[PDB]
Each structure stands twice: as C-alpha cells, then as structure tokens.
Design a protein around this ligand. Sequence first.
Ligand SMILES: Nc1ncnc2c1ncn2[C@H]1C[C@H](O)[C@@H](COP(=O)(O)OP(=O)(O)OP(=O)(O)O)O1
Ligand SMILES: [Mg+2]
Lengths: 538, 402
Amino acid sequence: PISPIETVPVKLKPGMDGPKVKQWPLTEEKIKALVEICTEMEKEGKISKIGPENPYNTPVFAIKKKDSTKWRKLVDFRELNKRTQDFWEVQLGIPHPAGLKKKKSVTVLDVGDAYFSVPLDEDFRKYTAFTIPSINNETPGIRYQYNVLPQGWKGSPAIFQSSMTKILEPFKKQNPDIVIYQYMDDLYVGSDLEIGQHRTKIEELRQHLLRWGLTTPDKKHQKEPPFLWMGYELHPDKWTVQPIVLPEKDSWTVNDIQKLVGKLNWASQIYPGIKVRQLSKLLRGTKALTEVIPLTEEAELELAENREILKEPVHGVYYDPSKDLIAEIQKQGQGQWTYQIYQEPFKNLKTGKYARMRGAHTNDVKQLTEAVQKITTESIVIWGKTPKFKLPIQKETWETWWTEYWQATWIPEWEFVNTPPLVKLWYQLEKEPIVGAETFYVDGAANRETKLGKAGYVTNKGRQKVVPLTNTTNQKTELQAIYLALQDSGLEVNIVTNSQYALGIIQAQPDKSESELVNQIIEQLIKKEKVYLAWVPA
Amino acid sequence: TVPVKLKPGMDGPKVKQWPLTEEKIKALVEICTEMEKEGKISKIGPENPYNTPVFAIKKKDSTKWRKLVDFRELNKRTQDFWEVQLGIPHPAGLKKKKSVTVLDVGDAYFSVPLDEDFRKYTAFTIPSINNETPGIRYQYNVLPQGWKGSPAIFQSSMTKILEPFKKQNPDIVIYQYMDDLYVGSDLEIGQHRTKIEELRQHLLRWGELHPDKWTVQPIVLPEKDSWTVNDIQKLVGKLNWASQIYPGIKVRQLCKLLRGTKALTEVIPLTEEAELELAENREILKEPVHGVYYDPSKDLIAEIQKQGQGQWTYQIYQEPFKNLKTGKYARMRGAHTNDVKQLTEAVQKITTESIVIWGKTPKFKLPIQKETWETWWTEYWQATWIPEWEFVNTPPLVKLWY
DNA sequence: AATTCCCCCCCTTCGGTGCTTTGCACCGAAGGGGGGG
Ligand SMILES: Nc1ncnc2c1ncn2[C@H]1C[C@H](O)[C@@H](COP(=O)(O)OP(=O)(O)OP(=O)(O)O)O1
Ligand SMILES: [Mg+2]
C-alpha cells in the first residue's frame, strides 16, 4: 500500500513554474501496459485523475524490467528536474562484499514497488501531471497526477532512502546484534543466530515493514545460498561476481571497445592481473561511436591475456576483524600496477589495478605513491582502516627519494617484498660539480613570431655546436640544448643551463614522459655515470 | 537570537563529505548521539541542499575525541562581521608578551541558540563503514564550533564574563579567535600558570607559546676562503634573486668573474672590488627590509618550503617579495619518518603565530600533492580552526632560504 | 531515434587557471562505458 510515513516538503526553484511538455507518440505495444499499469495504480490511490484545472504535462514511457515480463513506467521529468529545488544525496557509496563478515544465517529481501509506496508532497503533486495517450488516435487520453514518488524525478531516490532509513531505525535500535545492509530497497540481513531464530526474526522484520506499507513479496525473498546481492554471488564462506560475459566479435567499433573496457574494469575487482591500457589506447582520437577500429597487435595480446584470466573461476573471502589487512602491490609495466588486499596468504579479500597517468613526466616512485594513496582511500572506505603494504621497492631507494624530494611525500607502514620487476630510480644527479669532467654551457632561444630558434653549447675545452630548430619554442630549445650537451659529452659532464623549466623537469628524475624529447634526454641520462646540472641566470 | 545572513549574492556550502576511518566514525556517532539527545543538533532530510564536511580529532594529551566541522566555505560566505568578533581587530601588545596560553572555550558556544533561518546552512553528514546505511544528516540548533559567527554572537557574553577578571588584572591581554582564548602576560613563568588557573576557575564559575622567542631568519651568504666558479655562479644567482627583495643589490662586479667559459671546479681569486662589493652586499642583507607594512584589507599568504633533514622554511607576506615574516620550523629527531606529520605541525604553528601577530589565519601554499594531504592531514590535526590552503605543483629553484 | 533518476568506479577530452619563458603544466567537469537500485 502507501506508507503512513510523513512526506518530505518539496518546492520549485524561485520564480519557476511547472512543466508544460507535450506527450510524444507511443507504440501500441507500449500503450497496453501503461493503461494496464495506470488502471492498477489508480485503484490503489497511487495516481489520481485530474481535469482541466491542471495545466501541466510531462511525457511518459515504459521500459522492461529484469523480469522481462513486467513493465517499468517512467516519466521524462527533465524539464521539472531543471526547475526543482536542489537535494543533498545521502548515498555516499556502494557496499562491497569484501567488507562483509562471516555470518551463520543470511537472507536477502527486496521491497516490491519501492517508490510507489512512499507518499509525495501534496503541494508538489500538481506538477507531476501526465497523459496516457489513447490507443491509435481520437478520444483524448486520460490525465493523471502522482500521489507517490515518481520514477524519473531527481528527488525520488534521496526521499526514498531517507524514508527507508526512518522505517528501519526502530527495528535496528531494538535488534543491535543483526547486520542490515540497506541499498535503496535491497536489504541484506545477516545474523549469527540459528536458522530457526533467524527466520523468526526475518518474519518479524517483514511484519514491521508491512506495518509501514512496504511489502516484501516471496518471489524476491532469498533464503538459501548462493545469494544474488548487488551484482555478487554470496556463498557461506566466499563471494564471486555474477558471471561476466565478454564479447567474442571479429570487428570492433568504438562503442564495443568502450563496453569491453568497462566490463574488464568491473571484473578487475576480483580477477587478478587484468590489463586494459592497450585496449583503451584505441579510444583516443576517434570521434564516431560506430566507427570500426582495427585491433592492434598489442591490444590483441592483452585481450587474449584477459580472456585467459577470466577462464578460471576466482572467489573472494569475507573480512575478519581479528586479523590484519595486507595489500601487496605488483608492477605491470607501462605505468600499470596491480594490487591484492588479503588477510591470509593466497586468499584475496579483493583485487584491483591502478593505471592512471598523472603529469606530463613521472617516474615509478611517484606512480607507486599514487597507487598506495588510492588503495589507502579504498581500504578506508571499505573496511575503515589502512592496510599494511608490501611494495616492490627497497627501503634505501624510498629513503633517498623522499629525503631528496622537494615535496612532502609519505607511505604508511610497509615492508619490502622481493618480487621483480623492482621499483628504482634510473639515474641520480650529483650534488657537486664533477672534477675533471667537461663543462657545457648550454643556451637556447626561439623567437615567438617566426617560431624558429637556435640551441647550442660552448665547452671550456673550446668546442661549439649550434643547430637551428624549426617550429619549436623557447622551452623546447632549452631542452634540445641540454640534449645536445648530453649527446656530445663523455661519460661525465657538468651542464650549466639558463632554463628553470628544463632544470625543474630534469631534477624530478622522470623515466617516462609525454614528450619524445624528454624521453631521449632520459635515455641519455641513464647511460652516463655522473651528471651535474646547474642553473645560471641569463 | 541574533539574525544572521549570508553575504549578498552567495548561496551556501555544498561540500561533500570525505571518507573516515572506523574509530573516527564510531566517535562521531557517539558524540552526535549525545548532542542530539541534549538538543544541540537535530536530524534532517535530503530536502536541505547544503552540506559541510565533518571529522574527529584527538587533542594533544586528551584521550578524548572531539568533533570538528570544516566551516571554511560557510565562513567565507557569512557577513556577520559588523561585530568585529574580536573586540577591536587585534590587541597589538599580545606579540610582545613573555608567555601566551591558549584555552578552549568553544563549549560555551553550545548554550546560545542559533537563528532559525540560518540553521539549514550548518548541515553535515556522518558516513558509514562499507556504506552499510545512507549517511545520517544533522543540522545545528545552537552556535556551532568553527563558524566565524559564533565568537561574533558570544562576544557580548564573553566580554561580560571577563570583565571581573580583566579589570582586576590590567597587565594581562586576552584575545579571542574562534574557540580559542589567548591569555598573554609578562609575569613569572609560574605566576602565569597561577593566573591561568584562576581564569579557568572564573570561567567555570560563570556557567604555552613564547612570542618573545620568535625571531626572523635573514638571508645569509656563504663564507669561504677559496671560491670556485660554481660557488660564484650559485652566489650570483642568489644575489640576483635577493635584489628583488632588497633594492640596492649591486652584484655587478661579481658577474665580471663569470665572463668566458670556464671549468666549474677551478678556483677564482676574488678581486678587491669584488670583495668590497660582497662585503657591502652582506651588510645590506643583515638589516630588515623597510617600506613593508601590514594591510588589514588584504589577506595573508604563507609559503612553505622543505629543506630536508626535518627542516622547513616559511614566509608570510601580503605582496610578493615583501615578507611580513620569515621563519624556520625544525623537528628532526630521527627525521620522524613522516613528512605529512611535519607539514601539518608546521602549518598549525604558522597559523598560531599568524593569529597571535596579526589576528588572521593565512592562506597556505602547501608543497604537497593534493591527494596525500586530503588523505592524511586529519590524522595529525590538533587545532579547532582550519586555514584555507592551496597546493603547488611547481618545484622551486635552488632554495635561497636555507 | 529513443527519449527518465540517483550513487560509486575507469578512461578520454576540453576548457579554465596560474606563473611565466603568454607555453606549459595541472585540475575539474563532462562525454563514453561498467556495476547497483
Ligand atoms: N531504471 C530505473 N529508472 C528509475 N528508477 C529506477 C530504475 N530502476 C530502479 N529504480 C528505482 C525505482 C524503483 O522503485 C526502485 C527499486 O528498484 P526495483 O526493486 O527494481 O523496482 P520496484 O521496487 O519498483 O519493483 P519490484 O516490484 O520489481 O521490486 O529503484
Ligand atoms: Mg523492489
């Protein structure tokens, strides 16, 4: 029925009126369910007939539920959503099975007709007017207004969530030894009681919900494992994702690649070693969604590896508060990292990847710090605490990096694990000039109008070399001058530059960059033994 | 009830809540349950479109959790400033005091009801572990702690409370900023605690910094007997940069030795003219720069640099190259194995000094990645205020602040 | 050419901002996708 709970007062934005949109034509197959649906709701008082006193209207349509036999009735409330007051969303995230604990007895409940059981504010009801078009044509359609929360209105989710929280609070107050995960109308109820007492308490909860007009049909009530909860299969002592199907097509379009990348990202939370960079590299520079993209050799190999990974079945375990959280990080190459969070070895609580490229130039240590930060945030969200990290970086390397770096950086309590490839810095800049080396005073300029410039060096021995540069910039010319100095020098060099930009780039010790010139400079810097780079004002 | 209104044309805070650890969430839940039982806060719904972040801190040697609300956006949008809120912007005698004690008087704010039309702007959300339930929304019914208008409305009551004490002790300067009371006296180091205890008893009935040990750090120059080309190049660059701060830096006869390509390692004998010039330049560098004065209209900017080995340098200024204050914060021990904790302590110390000296918290240019700070700064924060900060992503040059 | 809403995530793109060498680096919002109800 309709909940006796109090309505939430809703108002339009100041100076705005209700929508007056016209209903678009609908197929005859659609206008057999809406008429069937609207007849039913009108019987239960969820919608009310209106006359000519209401000048508002809004298009309605219908889609198919996951049942594939019922129809979900939706209203295109975009115009009303524009003029509706702002709400604050109370859903701050998504529950994860890895944050669940071992419970002897588990049940899952779904509220039937969730939104249509919560009343709508009386003064806001007139703005939800809609028309059900007549079959074929003629005989103008019946006009209704919503007495309950409509589907498609931007205020419905928050209002329903608050109403459900208010309904559940009296039950949870008097039953503190029972865990209730509440997501919209989906309720996961877990307890350590025996099955008989658990079923008695579930019946009590169902009666309490029915007292507030929230019905829980037996069709959507699960009592035996595995439980289909929030996209996962929950067993007594393990959890899995519901089966993930990857397309097996021969010709790939942009939309297909996007769907595959999204599905692989979803599957990466429990399947270890998922790589997606090569596939996602095909999505840049392409405009049309239906444009066919030939699969590159690198993308095909990564797709084959991912298909290999998904072949075997993997499972995750439940959280144990009495044990310790350990997050192990592995390098995957080309700025890709994987991580496994577990409490016991070879029993993963969850898995994940980090492959975000931040900054034009960066090294492995910065990316490892970013991955640690992401894992820390995710662990705080899920379990409420930071794990102990197993990183493939030596303690001396981290000590040198964080003591010589100009930024305040930190990694929480961690220990070194010897799993190659190891994280290291590929070169170091001397803090003092090298005695007996050769000194290259490098210069580089470029006029801003003609976009031509010069870049060269002079050494104390008496060698000079200038190379004109076309379609360059002053920063590019300075970088090119440093590159010339690195190229023409020996195994030890003392480079003196007038560029703060080039020095600031080089001092960060990057090993990958978005600029090819910086990449060549890095390759040259790796070869040398001692390099001293100094700044001098022009 | 004192009506409060936002600054004309402003909307209200709509800041999202960041995730919290389990202990912080448990402490917040207990504290907010007690507060709602006592009527200080009330549960609200989603029809309130405003939100501000909340978290919990354990104050220095307290073993008791305290709820802190980040009212920075609400503070920047509130007009309640006709009431200076400080009783005259700033006692200019607090900085020249032997000892200053900071006391927490924010609980006294929990007895003054807040204006009904303004309560909706004080809404906050408590999250849940593993998103088990939707976050619980509350709004304040009394004057909140951390809002700049709370001292502005309790100001009359605060002055009434302290009159029996201030009149009896005319040699003690009392300043109020947010929930903090700064008590500065020039008495003996023990008599100061005696007076502080008397003031605490007086406050209870009615319902330690050392600013004289604060010294600026002037820009210095290296002292060497034999000078190489590299040393002169590093010194010329330092003097050229310092010429922007101290007009009158010559550095013209020192650049003559830097003519012609030359080895960075070999030594250069300084000429008598170069030596004189360097001595004069050092003489100019040991005197404080004149022509710089604090402007109450403009805001304060604090820059922090990491010098390594547990050393940080900071400059508080209103205009570039005109530093109102320069200083160094050092806490090494065994490097403390934590840069974020050191930076947080430095920020708190600099903010306390700024409040004592000018009565305003500065805007910080933190030398840290944003994500690290937002992840870890709440674990070491111990102050009831939160200054505005921005994050730099550009590395400084060869640091001249040492 | 089917048209809806809210939430979290990833990956790419484009415009805004700041310091400076008016280019270059960084960041946030919006587009696509995945998942949930
Ligand atoms: N596609 C959607 N568009 C808009 N709102 C939706 C959509 N899917 C779900 N919701 C919202 C409105 C629903 O009332 C609420 C609960 O979802 P769901 O249980 O699938 O529907 P329901 O409770 O109306 O039907 P049922 O009787 O099948 O349980 O979530
Ligand atoms: Mg349902």
